[PDB]
Ligand binder design. Structure first.
Ligand SMILES: Nc1ncnc2c1ncn2[C@@H]1O[C@H](COP(=O)(O)OP(=O)(O)OP(O)(O)=S)[C@@H](O)[C@H]1O
Ligand SMILES: Nc1ncnc2c1ncn2[C@@H]1O[C@H](COP(=O)(O)OP(=O)(O)OP(O)(O)=S)[C@@H](O)[C@H]1O
Ligand SMILES: Nc1ncnc2c1ncn2[C@@H]1O[C@H](COP(=O)(O)OP(=O)(O)O)[C@@H](O)[C@H]1O
Ligand SMILES: [Mg+2]
Ligand SMILES: [Mg+2]
Ligand SMILES: [Mg+2]
Ligand SMILES: [Zn+2]
Lengths: 645, 245, 647
DNA sequence: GTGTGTTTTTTTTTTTTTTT
DNA sequence: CACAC
């Protein structure tokens, strides 16, 4: 075990070389000590340290190569060295009589460049076993959090002595050791009865998730492939199904593969999985950034400056989908949806939803699906759905069975996963009626209920619904009222804040402008691409893993996403009496209007007006709603209903 | 087994085999290959007495549609055949040669043959920075009187196209065209199995008897023939795969 | 080998200080816990609730005068299981003698004690025998710490902070924690064996075997000294009379909707309650349960299959629910506030207009009483209304204010059988039976299938639903007041179209309802304006625009119904005469109207009028059914009938 | 002392198919 | 795997 000590001491020398890790350890220890000294508080920092592989390579290339080649013999010594360093500089406070027994090993985390070890579940060949690799994918299945024993403490009530027995498993420790029968020793060696001392025994949270590659880099004619990852201790519950992620960990192998006289000729392989060491939640489909995008002070200052622009609303609306010609009011409604109004959690169980749900029905090839595709590519949490390609069980909740434990469980559907997000439903008229009541309940009360298979639960899906629909006929018939032109119940239409009618009327000047714009779009050439060259995709932009006035016509899409996130987080507008007068006046005028006879205008339209005013106040970043918000909301609603302007 | 080699009134016989190392991921389902291997035996414990499961251990593959993907989405083209392709591209009458090379047994139908050539070539896929994409496939429908070799044209297209799936109008279900949610018999878990049109990813699907589409089955292709994507939300599975067919 | 570790807990000093605490604690009669132990000796109590506040106060007292404590409050939150046995042994050591003439007619354990003592003593002179748990007729539980509001709560006292299921990390195993959550499934009471009391066929010996493993093996081998020395090899016979059993219940508590992060699924936790805490929980309970968090093992062969991955449960110790003085108060409200008008607005303060529908809701909440048969005291109304009218909000408010009130949509009741394969339970409930002595708020009554149609029918003329799974024909009582919130088909209601043609419900079922109202919205200049003002004010202040008396508590209706149920306002002979001529003239005007045929007067309308008058007098003292009562009931009925003929 | 035996599952959810 | 047959 001399090599183990040599690796330990070289790692400690490396740690002393870069004191930033020492400062991070000190900060974590003092934060935990202060929280312990300070009440309804439960936020405790973990015993994990994130290092950069580049610094290790610069200091000792041999150690870095051993880490990236055979981590099973290099990371345990590093963990021991980190634990020794932490204890040495530990504030040595009064022991809790538990931390002495309850071990707290200091986990290791990694970031930086990985090279050929940045892989995908499809490309994870068997040659990478026992080698540390980084794999990107989507979380699809998550087993229930299940603690497991690693160390049992027992008290002998005949000698007054505490005996500990450490338990090891192939899924717990990297180095292979004899599995322990997981039996508590009830008797001492000297015939003394031992009582199992819970609380002083040590258990760790364990989880088993499934990570599969991107559907979009999945090769033609092949379905995405998946691997199993074992998150442990801190990493449990840090991810949920439907999350894009990049995990860094050891590609380990388990099982007997037959080879036990049970299967001598049978050709079954071995169990392969990943013991996750680091999780980095890349999201927003940008391939390298998280959903909660970091906001620099310069970006916040620029956002504040642009908030003083008079027509910033119009600029952002037009900057949404530049490649989509026209449809300006639709873009305004989309921008309002992406960053909507406030949700009122009233008393006595009353609940007023703040999400905006818009149904837009129109003629074929009117960019109805492309608008939803753009919203999917832009929104922080957007889930795609097809009316034909969807089942209510697969839309809300599915009663499956667990495999790690072997018993019943619920799995989230398409809208539950989109909680606090947006659901883009194409071919809305094509949805099955039996499962259409479920989405109706969703958009009605933002909650689903399950009362089957001995499971009586109520899940929350506070999503914003955008739907694209086609007329009953091949095209819309303006000679008919907008009830028979739609094959959906008017009760289903009522819960939508806005219903947008798209007509593909054949103009000449407008058609010429559309054709010119579409041709300008189609003649675009990517910067790093030549003419007559196929647009190949690799997306291996993860060169490093982890964190490693003004009047512009159109802003960049990531900047717009940052602005939307900052607005949703920061400003909580308050409705104002000046907006109240305008809202009530417009609601009264629209309600008792002759042209509004065909309209379904009811009290829900007042809720739509309030939500639109709140969203428009969010657009201005004003912490209170104002008259201009009410005027713009009334104009947009009047456009949605009548379409005159 | 090859459909042309099945016995009369007999369903095709399946047979399991195993690749190894460099032979792994050499082909994809739907491809016609030839295998030289060892006819081996293993005893599965899953209903007679002293029965033994037969299989093949592979020692060679001879395909004609290249490796996984379309030659792994890159050129496996040797210099001689590439130079021959360049020489063919410089033929001024190449358009006429290709038109005459489409369904030679089918008389006339020159415009249809030229449209088939255009479809087999297809446009260039465009991916804008803003996020939405522009497809590069061509969708062609052939209406007309029966007995005009339209089915023969579809069969020839399926024969000549590197990736092609030929389907019948009546024998077609929406869950069988794009994706089927099936429960795993052993693990009791649901999973997706690619449909007919998915197997034709990057190629072409020749749907005969298009008038015999079930109205609930015909609509299921509206998204995928335009967006080139298939959205599935079933049995706790929510995915959006690509089908550029 | 078994390695050893050193831990500063000092179980011996802790036990001695525990004895000192029990003996020498006098809360601000003698010591409280010595009084409780004496009462236990009097067989007047078998539930020792160890309050953490008492231990904390004892530590506070002795800290000022010697610091003779080791922070036991923090010391037992680390491993409460051992301290439970420590407290049990302390109670047994300081167990007082009985100070009451308790009858010992059923003293089987005492009989066994004295018999075995005499049997041992007759050879002891040569001319522990009993388990410590067996002698105990009591059970000990822990009461969690209250709020501190002091520096002692320096993130400590984990039992004082209500956790959620997701907050229960594996490190908390062995701690005494607490959770806040809603039950979903409670098991039945079952006898779990504590110690078996085998008796040998020969050698006359009885051997005890304590078991805490959820599964054990019989002895059936006379290892007793006499049997062993004689080599008789007698088999042991299990004896329920001398064996010790404990009532047990296994609940399955889920986490509240607020404790679930976005895009996640609520979890569950199994709770093992035993002793006198059994039967203290129901599925419809939202509670703060404090107990010991323990890793229930896969003892047997499944442990080998699974490994170190164990399962967890909570050994609950304390439960706190969340959910004629009031009688004098409701007379005060009656004299001050006009219930007919004030409580009408109180039902739907946030809903503007439709005050008569609110009064009908009050009458339905009160309900008639004609239990004598020869009928029914349930008032039923259907709110067909019009899409866009706040019928759903009215039903939600009724559900939140009516005791045993449940709300559901037409499309989701009914019943199910043997939902879990493992336990194979019997006769699961539904939604209609949930509001047995309550009201069911049926939204989407139109979008409701023939099966539930016949179910709610059988309920409404039977006050009971029935199922026939396998010819069992078992039935579940549901005397539920029916509150329907259907809406006219094809969206908006058509006044020109007949009301029964506007809704896809059978006319027979509709006529059997006691009363029905058309409340459809019509675009006006002022009513919409005032409603918009109301909604805007609610948005401003998160509260109603209080312009009148707005009582909140619904227990006033509870007092009214409980008071006047026994009273049973007797109909007067003049009442019967006036209602009989009322029926005569109502049928006459129904014929002379024959414009919609639904306006025909029926004896069912007479039953509805009788029960409405009964409810009216039920709210107003007793025997108020007179000319005024029947006039009010007939006015309401005629208003409802004209509502169908509105415009 | 050599060699066993469990724990161990068919629900709910899709997809098809014939009637209705 | 390991305790019970
Ligand atoms: N122009 C043509 N040249 C050669 N053969 C032809 C031509 N038109 C028709 N045929 C023959 O006519 C037959 C047509 O059969 P199919 O192709 O199966 O039917 P179809 O023409 O597609 O029309 P359907 O399927 O009945 S609507 C084949 O035997 C063809 O060879
Ligand atoms: N008189 C009213 N007072 C207050 N709010 C009202 C009133 N009428 C309607 N509302 C509002 O309208 C909404 C409730 O309408 P709903 O009850 O859902 O309409 P509906 O007739 O039940 O349509 P359904 O659900 O298809 S039957 C809430 O936002 C209420 O605030
Ligand atoms: N206003 C527009 N500007 C630019 N392109 C448009 C517009 N309307 C339609 N298109 C084009 O039509 C094509 C198909 O649109 P699609 O999303 O299928 O509409 P729909 O869902 O109504 O059929 C898209 O490729 C898009 O480029
Ligand atoms: Mg489209
Ligand atoms: Mg044909
Ligand atoms: Mg409603
Ligand atoms: Zn005996």
């Amino acid at each position: 075990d001399a090599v183990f000590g040599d690796r330990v001491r070289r790692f400690q020398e490396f740690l002393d070389t870069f004191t930033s890790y020492r400062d991070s350890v000190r900060s974590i220890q003092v934060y935990n000590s202060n929280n312990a000294a300070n009440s309804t508080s439960l936020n405790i920092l973990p015993h994990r340290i994130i290092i950069s592989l580049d610094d290790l390579r610069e200091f000792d290339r041999s150690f870095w190569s051993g880490i990236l080649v055979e981590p099973a013999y290099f990371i345990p010594p590093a963990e021991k060295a980190l634990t020794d360093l932490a204890d040495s500089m530990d504030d040595v406070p009064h022991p809790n009589a538990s931390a002495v027994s309850s071990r707290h090993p200091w986990k290791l985390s990694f970031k930086g460049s990985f090279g050929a070890h940045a892989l995908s579940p499809r490309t994870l060949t068997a040659q990478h076993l026992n080698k540390l690799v980084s794999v990107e994918g989507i979380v699809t299945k998550t087993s229930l959090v299940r603690p497991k024993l690693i160390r049992s403490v027992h008290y002998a009530a005949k000698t007054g002595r505490f005996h500990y027995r450490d338990y090891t498993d192939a899924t717990t420790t990297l180095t292979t050791r004899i599995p322990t029968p997981a039996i508590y020793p009830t008797e001492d060696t000297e015939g003394n009865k031992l009582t199992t001392e819970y609380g002083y025994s040590t258990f760790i949270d364990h989880q088993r998730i499934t990570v599969q590659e991107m559907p979009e880099m999945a090769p033609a004619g092949q379905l995405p492939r998946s691997i199993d990852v074992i998150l442990d201790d801190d990493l449990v519950d840090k991810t949920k199904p439907g999350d894009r992620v990049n995990v860094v960990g050891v590609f380990k192998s388990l099982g007997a593969g037959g080879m036990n006289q049970s299967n001598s000729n049978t050709l079954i392989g071995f169990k392969t999985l990943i013991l996750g060491n680091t999780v980095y939640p890349l999201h927003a489909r940008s391939t390298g950034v998280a959903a909660r995008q970091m906001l620099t002070d310069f970006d916040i200052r620029n956002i504040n400056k642009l908030s003083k622009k008079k027509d910033i609303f119009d600029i952002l609306s037009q900057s949404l989908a530049p490649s989509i010609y026209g449809h300006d009011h639709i873009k305004k409604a989309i921008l309002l949806m992406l960053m909507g109004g406030v949700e009122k959690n009233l008393e006595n169980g009353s609940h007023l939803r703040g999400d905006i749900n818009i149904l837009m029905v129109g003629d074929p090839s009117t960019a109805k699906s492309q608008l939803l595709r753009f919203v999917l590519n832009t929104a922080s949490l957007a889930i795609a759905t097809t009316g034909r390609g969807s089942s209510g069980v697969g839309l809300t909740a599915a009663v499956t069975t667990d495999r790690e434990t072997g018993e019943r469980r619920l799995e989230a559907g398409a809208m539950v996963l989109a909680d606090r997000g947006v659901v883009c439903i194409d071919e809305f008229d094509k949805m099955t009626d039996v499962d259409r009541v479920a989405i109706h309940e969703v958009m009605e009360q933002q909650t689903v209920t399950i009362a089957k298979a001995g499971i009586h639960t109520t899940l929350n899906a506070r999503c914003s619904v955008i739907a694209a629909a086609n007329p009953v006929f091949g095209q819309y018939d303006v000679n008919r009222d907008p009830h028979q032109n739609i094959a959906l119940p008017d009760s289903l239409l009522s819960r939508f804040d806005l219903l947008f009618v798209v007509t593909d009327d054949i103009n000449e000047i407008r058609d010429r402008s559309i054709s010119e714009h579409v041709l300008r779009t189609h003649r675009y050439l990517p910067p790093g691409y030549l003419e007559g060259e196929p647009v190949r995709e690799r997306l291996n932009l993860s060169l490093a893993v982890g964190e490693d006035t003004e009047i512009p016509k159109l802003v960049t899409i990531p900047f717009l996403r940052k602005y939307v996130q900052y607005a949703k987080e920061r400003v909580i507008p308050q409705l104002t009496q000046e907006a109240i007068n305008v809202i009530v006046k417009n609601y009264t005028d629209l309600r008792n209007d002759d042209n509004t006879k065909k309209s379904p205008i009811t009290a829900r339209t007042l809720e739509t007006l309030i939500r639109l005013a709140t969203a428009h106040a969010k657009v201005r970043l004003s912490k209170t709603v104002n008259k201009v918000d009410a005027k713009v909301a009334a104009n947009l609603l009047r456009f949605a209903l009548l379409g005159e302007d | 087994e090859i459909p042309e080699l099945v016995p009369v009134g007999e369903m095709p016989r399946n047979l399991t085999m195993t690749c190894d190392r460099y032979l792994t991921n050499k082909v994809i389902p739907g491809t016609r290959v030839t295998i030289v291997g060892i006819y081996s035996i293993y005893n599965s414990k899953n209903s007679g007495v002293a029965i033994r499961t037969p299989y093949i251990k592979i020692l060679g593959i001879q395909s004609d549609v290249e490796t996984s993907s379309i030659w792994n989405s890159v050129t496996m083209f040797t210099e001689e055949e590439e130079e021959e392709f360049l020489q063919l591209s410089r033929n001024p009458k190449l358009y006429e040669i290709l038109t005459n090379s489409i369904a030679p047994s089918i008389f006339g139908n020159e415009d249809i043959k030229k449209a088939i050539v255009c479809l087999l070539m297809g446009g260039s896929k465009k991916i804008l920075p803003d996020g939405m994409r522009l497809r590069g496939d061509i969708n062609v429908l052939l209406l007309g009187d029966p007995g005009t070799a339209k089915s023969q044209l579809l069969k020839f297209v399926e024969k000549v196209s590197p990736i092609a799936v030929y389907t019948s109008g009546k024998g077609s279900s929406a869950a069988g065209l794009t994706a089927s949610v099936q429960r795993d018999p052993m693990t009791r878990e649901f999973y997706l199995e690619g449909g007919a049109m998915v197997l034709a990813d990057g190629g072409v699907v020749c749907i005969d008897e298009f008038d015999k589409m079930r109205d609930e089955d015909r609509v299921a292709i509206h998204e995928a023939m335009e967006q080139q994507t298939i959205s599935i939300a079933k049995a706790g599975i929510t995915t959006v795969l690509n089908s550029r067919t | 080998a078994l390695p050893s570790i050193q831990l500063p807990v000092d179980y011996n000093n802790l036990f001695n200080e525990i004895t000192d605490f029990l003996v020498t604690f006098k809360q601000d009669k003698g010591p409280k816990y010595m009084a409780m132990l004496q009462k236990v000796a009097n067989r007047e109590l078998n539930s020792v609730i160890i309050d953490l506040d008492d231990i904390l106060q004892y530590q506070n007292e002795k800290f000022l005068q010697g610091t003779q404590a080791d922070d036991l409050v923090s010391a037992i939150q680390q491993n409460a299981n051992h301290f439970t046995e420590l407290f049990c042994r302390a109670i047994d050591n300081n167990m007082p003698l009985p100070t009451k003439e308790i009858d010992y007619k059923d003293d089987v354990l005492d009989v066994i004690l004295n018999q075995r003592r005499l049997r041992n003593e007759r050879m002891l002179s040569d001319r522990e025998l009993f388990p410590p748990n067996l002698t105990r007729r009591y059970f000990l539980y822990f009461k969690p710490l209250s709020q501190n509001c002091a520096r002692r709560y320096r993130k400590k006292a984990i039992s004082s902070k209500p956790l959620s299921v997701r907050q229960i990390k594996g490190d908390f195993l062995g701690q005494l924690i607490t959770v806040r959550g809603i039950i979903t499934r409670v098991s039945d009471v079952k006898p779990a064996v504590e110690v078996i009391a085998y008796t040998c066929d020969q050698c006359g010996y009885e051997v005890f075997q304590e078991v805490n493993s959820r599964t054990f093996t019989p002895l059936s081998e006379c290892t007793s000294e006499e049997c062993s020395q004689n080599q008789t090899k007698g088999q042991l016979f299990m004896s329920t009379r001398a064996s010790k059993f404990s009532a047990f219940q296994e609940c399955k508590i889920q986490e509240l909707s607020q404790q679930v992060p976005v895009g996640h699924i609520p979890r569950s936790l199994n709770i093992h309650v035993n002793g006198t805490l059994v039967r203290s929980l129901s599925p419809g309970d939202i509670v703060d349960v404090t107990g010991i968090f323990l890793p229930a093992p896969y003892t047997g062969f499944k442990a080998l299959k699974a490994g170190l991955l164990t399962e967890t449960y909570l050994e609950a110790q304390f439960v706190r629910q969340h959910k004629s003085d009031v009688e004098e108060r409701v007379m005060e409200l009656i004299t001050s506030g006009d219930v007919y008008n004030r409580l009408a607005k109180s039902i739907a303060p946030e809903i503007y207009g439709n005050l008569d529908v609110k009064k009908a809701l009050l009458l339905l909440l009160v309900g008639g009483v004609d239990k004598r048969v020869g009928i029914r005291g349930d008032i039923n109304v259907c709110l067909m209304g019009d899409p866009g009218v706040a019928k759903s909000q009215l039903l939600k408010a009724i559900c939140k204010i009516s005791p045993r009130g449940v709300y559901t949509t037409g499309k989701g009741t009914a019943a199910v059988m043997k939902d879990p394969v493992t336990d194979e339970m019997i006769l699961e409930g539904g939604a209609l039976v949930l509001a047995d002595n309550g009201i069911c708020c049926i939204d989407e009554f139109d979008k409701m299938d023939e099966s539930d149609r016949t179910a709610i029918h059988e309920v409404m003329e039977q006050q009971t639903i029935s199922i026939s799974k396998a010819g069992i024909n078992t039935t579940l009582n549901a005397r539920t007041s029916i509150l329907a919130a259907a809406n006219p088909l094809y969206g908006r209601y058509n006044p020109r179209l007949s009301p029964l043609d506007n809704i896809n419900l059978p006319a027979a079922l509709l006529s059997r309802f006691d009363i029905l109202f058309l409340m459809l919205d019509i675009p006006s200049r002022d009513d919409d304006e005032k409603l918009a003002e109301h909604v805007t004010y609610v948005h401003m202040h998160n509260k109603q625009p209080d312009l009148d008396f707005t009582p909140v508590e619904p227990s006033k209706m509870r007092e009214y119904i409980a008071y006047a149920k026994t009273k049973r306002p007797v109909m007067s002979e003049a009442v019967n005469d006036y209602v009989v001529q009322a029926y005569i003239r109502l049928r006459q005007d129904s014929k002379r109207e024959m414009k919609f045929s639904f306006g025909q007067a029926t004896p069912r309308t007479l039953l509805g009028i009788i029960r409405l008058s009964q409810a009216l007098a039920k709210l107003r003292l007793a025997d108020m059914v007179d000319i005024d009562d029947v006039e009010e009931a007939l006015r309401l009925v005629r208003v409802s009938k004209e509502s169908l003929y509105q415009e």
